[PDB]
């Protein structure tokens, strides 16, 4: 309902969403934009963003 409210017919979407006690899951990328969370796309995907970077032993030797 957060993604749809920011698109069109905001009044309608918000009344309908209130009557239905809808719970937005926040997984969308527009929702992530609104709440200030990294979008679930590109560099924001769990696969890339949680990368752990370590120097190899041979390089630490030198």
């Amino acid at each position: 309902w957060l993604s749809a409210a920011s698109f069109q017919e905001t009044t309608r979407v918000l009344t309908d969403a209130a009557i239905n006690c809808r719970s937005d899951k926040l997984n969308g990328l527009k929702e992530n934009v609104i709440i200030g969370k990294l979008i679930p796309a590109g560099t924001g995907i769990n696969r890339y963003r949680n990368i752990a970077v370590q120097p190899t032993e041979e390089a630490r030797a030198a």
Binding site: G42, T43, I45, Y48, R49, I51, V53, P55, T56
Partner: protein
């Protein structure tokens, strides 16, 4: 077969992409390494693995380290 690369162009992007599965992973790769470097400089944890340029930015140091295969990364 390319001429001398300048600035951002160095190191070449084709070989950096040859080091990593996707460009996004190269971004987070080099970024987190650069943060490690800067933290090492300020904290007086592991320093640069190449010979740094004069004032050279930590992100450039990181990209050069990746180009030389000096570090490993887990995707998770």
């Amino acid at each position: 077969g390319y001429d001398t690369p300048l600035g951002i162009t160095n190191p070449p992007i084709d070989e950096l992409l040859d080091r990593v599965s996707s460009k996004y992973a190269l971004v987070i790769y080099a970024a987190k390494r650069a943060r490690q470097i800067n933290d090492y400089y300020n904290q007086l944890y592991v320093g640069p693995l190449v010979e740094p340029g004069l004032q050279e930015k930590p992100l450039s140091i990181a990209l050069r380290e990746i180009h030389a295969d000096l570090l490993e990364h887990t995707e998770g």
